[PDB]
Design a protein around this ligand. Sequence first.
Ligand SMILES: Nc1ncnc2c1ncn2[C@@H]1O[C@H](COP(=O)(O)OP(=O)(O)O)[C@@H](O)[C@H]1O
Ligand SMILES: Nc1ncnc2c1ncn2[C@@H]1O[C@H](COP(=O)(O)OP(=O)(O)O)[C@@H](O)[C@H]1O
Lengths: 485, 485, 68, 70
Amino acid sequence: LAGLSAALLRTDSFVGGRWLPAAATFPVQDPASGAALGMVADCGVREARAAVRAAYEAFCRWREVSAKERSSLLRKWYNLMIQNKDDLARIITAESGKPLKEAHGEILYSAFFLEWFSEEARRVYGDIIHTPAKDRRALVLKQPIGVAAVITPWNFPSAMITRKVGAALAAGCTVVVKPAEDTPFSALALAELASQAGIPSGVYNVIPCSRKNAKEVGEAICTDPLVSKISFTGSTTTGKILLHHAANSVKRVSMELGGLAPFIVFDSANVDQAVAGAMASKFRNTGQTAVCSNQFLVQRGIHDAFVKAFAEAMKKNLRVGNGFEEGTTQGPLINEKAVEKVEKQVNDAVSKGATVVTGGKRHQLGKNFFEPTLLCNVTQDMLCTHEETFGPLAPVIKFDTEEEAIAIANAADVGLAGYFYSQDPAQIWRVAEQLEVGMVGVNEGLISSVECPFGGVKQSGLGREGSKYGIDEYLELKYVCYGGL
Amino acid sequence: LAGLSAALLRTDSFVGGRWLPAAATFPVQDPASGAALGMVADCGVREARAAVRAAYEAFCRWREVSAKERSSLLRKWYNLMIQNKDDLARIITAESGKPLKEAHGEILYSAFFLEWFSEEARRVYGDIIHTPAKDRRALVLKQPIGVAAVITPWNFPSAMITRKVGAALAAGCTVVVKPAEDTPFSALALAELASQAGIPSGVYNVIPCSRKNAKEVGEAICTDPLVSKISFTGSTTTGKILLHHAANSVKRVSMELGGLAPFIVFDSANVDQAVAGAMASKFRNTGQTAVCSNQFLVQRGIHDAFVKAFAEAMKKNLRVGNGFEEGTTQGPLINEKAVEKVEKQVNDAVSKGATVVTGGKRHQLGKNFFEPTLLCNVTQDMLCTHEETFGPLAPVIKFDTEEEAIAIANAADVGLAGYFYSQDPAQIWRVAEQLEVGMVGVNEGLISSVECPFGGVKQSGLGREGSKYGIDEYLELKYVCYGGL
Amino acid sequence: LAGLSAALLRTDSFVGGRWLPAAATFPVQDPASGAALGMVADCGVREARAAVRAAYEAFCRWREVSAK
Amino acid sequence: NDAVSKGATVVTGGKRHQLGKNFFEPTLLCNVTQDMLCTHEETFGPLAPVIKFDTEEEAIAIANAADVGL
Ligand SMILES: Nc1ncnc2c1ncn2[C@@H]1O[C@H](COP(=O)(O)OP(=O)(O)O)[C@@H](O)[C@H]1O
Ligand SMILES: Nc1ncnc2c1ncn2[C@@H]1O[C@H](COP(=O)(O)OP(=O)(O)O)[C@@H](O)[C@H]1O
């Protein structure tokens, strides 16, 4: 529970290098025990506009700072995260409910993003191009966009912020962060460290706010003429709303929208491995992530052997309980409406053919705990209105051929992540290239990596985060025609 | 006038490798003489949806074609353009009204884009990234987005299409082109050559339509779920409308929106050169382009000498007349409403201080011809609602300091192109980096180049066309985590 | 019926000394036999405003021409 | 699709023909049930749904189902 570091756990918003409370506040409770965590400032349109101005003014100075200097600050920020990793992780588990171990995993990952972009800052290179004309030279400079509005989800209350903000700052931009009301603390803990690190005032701003204020606040920062860019990770519905906001001022946009995620297991797959991957990919964060494999397409031949091994792994490894409790691998669902969606998806399925192999009802721990569920004999049509239902539920759809498996996977007009196990060299290339998805896992169920491009195709998003391509979402190209020669 | 090549001048739409007429047709007239050029198909929402399907189906096959093959087809298309350059140019002058010489310039430029991207097709490279995990390898593939909706203006009826389409095809995408009603012929002449070149059916589609059908048609193709990308060049107003269209399906977008364009002449500038540049940049296409320097910021010291030399160059070189007429450097304005905007801008200015140095009224040739006008003693506030008034008008605003000149230039929340003449090494870098614009001309007034990145910052656009960055607007990154090692 | 003089029987509008077709056309039929006579340009507000301008500009020169 | 996703079993055909455009593969589905013919009483295409029956009284009862008889 408590015992943290007074400085890391914050309740006020962070604007212009100062902790500022709002007129109102919203409650944040531990999703597992229900305990009150704290009263967080609930910023409104005014606080937002103020935060934007703070960022816009910081930008004009920040863009001037040398890259080697911005790199150094990003690294100091990284080091501070590592030094305080245990507390930072307790905060994640306290508000997201994910197991302490999974929180430790996020903090490292989150830290690695600041570290990674710290290294990118000094590597923004312009070009020198040859043109026919002998009286001129072509130079191409890359410069930061300006101020960016950053809006993140509760899933990875730390990493989701750090992967955008690190790139933003690396390029020379300032940011205004609007964290999820379920998990605002992680965003503010970062702010505390950003000041300890020496990040100049106004570069990193955080404006927490409740569901009520979300619509109004989001509209303010995504509309402000002082904001030139928008970075968002969440549901498609919200994404489209922001894209409309951006459209009025032609703002640069980048986002990731929670799509499905097929997990195709072919006959040539190593079962134990397929299962291990199925385990890791589906039950991490209790199945509450946009990369959590939802539909399992298992081939006839290997089907039965798979489904039986999968379930036996669920019994041997999934221990539902409180995130801080030792030996827990399954935390609670973020809230009630969430539990309602799983139940909904489970019943609708069963009452349409589906066969429950394990789990199936709320866990007898009560509250927001649900039993890890594995249903087989599932069909495609049983995945409607549930394309955005995150929970520890794994529907297994049997398939015959590879053309079929691929046809089903590419069904959705959404494509984020995709997984598949196979021992066929050629099949691996065919499927990997044909899966209209942004990220493909081959014989692996956990593909996280700060040095690789994340994002989706079609309606799953725009742009990419992480890797050598992330910083591009925050730069503008300027062709300079040096003539008169 | 006539005498062209029956095959190059077309009146039907081009869909699926076939010339198809619509239920209705719209007239196209020579903007100079008023002569009837022809009756062009006026496609509606039905023809559009049909063209999209044709493209979507062609895509599934086209994406499969080798890059070396797509490169070869793009080059054959290029060669065909060169072989038919004289006719292709007559067509541009016939519908846009720009001088035959300027049309010859566009055809080469237009051809060079197909040539340039032909070379890019074989150079789309993926990456291999090192990650800590020893049991996995990271691969990054680049694949075409799918079908792209392309909407172009009348200014460069050929080049505007060719710079987007060449990249689109280079990446492996198919396209559906909706040309400007003022200049549809150039788009269809290209289609004729694309079939001669052997471009597979459905890869390049053209759906002409009148003002009436513009709204409906644009909405159809920019909304169709079979279209994954949108490329547009035109006014900001239309751009925002399309961005809203795209927002509903999270479509990839890229566009260029007609901003202003400062032309700052400093005291250290070589007058004759500054003037030569001012001439070329302002009166090319009779001042009807988004890169046409509108406001001239000339420094006190060199002011008077400049304004006097500028005007004397206007008398010695600008000869208003019919584009096909020999010795013509000024064609007509696209239409009546256009002439009305210039007059409007000229009067509003004069009746607010401005002093007319030359020109000022409609040219006594009648119709859509306007006298090249040069007004000095102009002030900033005299540029409202006229930020999108293209015409042979040059308002000269005097300035004192460089901080001032820059402050005024960056005034607009629009930044496309910018120019400035100076002989100060350090001043050149300061201004070039500070001009919040997408392209900067240093001691040069004509910066066109297929191998350099075109586009704008802020509200002037999204993405870039041409150069090594153009093809990026049509690809999607796919991170492939090869695990199980 | 036919056999006239190609030049005398016209289907396009006449503006500014040029024969110009409109986006649409309307049918003209012999009121006695019902036979199709031809498809005539169907000018709209745009063609009209254009014709007015053509006339207004011609006027400024025409008024100058001697009466003789 | 509505059929398959309700029990129907595709014996042949089933998707658009790979000739593209308006060409569809001749399709034969068996294991079809009555209720899978709604809003499709006016869907003309190369599709043949096979509904198994036991008795003649039954066959006739199903055939005369529709309030349409051509
Ligand atoms: N209309 C909206 N405008 C702006 N931000 C919004 C809006 N709706 C939700 N958000 C914000 O988006 C983030 C999460 O997006 P949301 O679509 O609610 O996904 P989820 O609940 O699945 O995490 C949160 O920070 C939330 O406050
Ligand atoms: N509402 C609209 N929807 C789709 N396309 C449009 C719309 N308005 C104009 N266009 C198209 O955009 C192109 C030119 O854009 P426009 O904003 O009219 O610029 P301009 O007239 O300055 O060239 C033309 O091809 C035109 O038909």
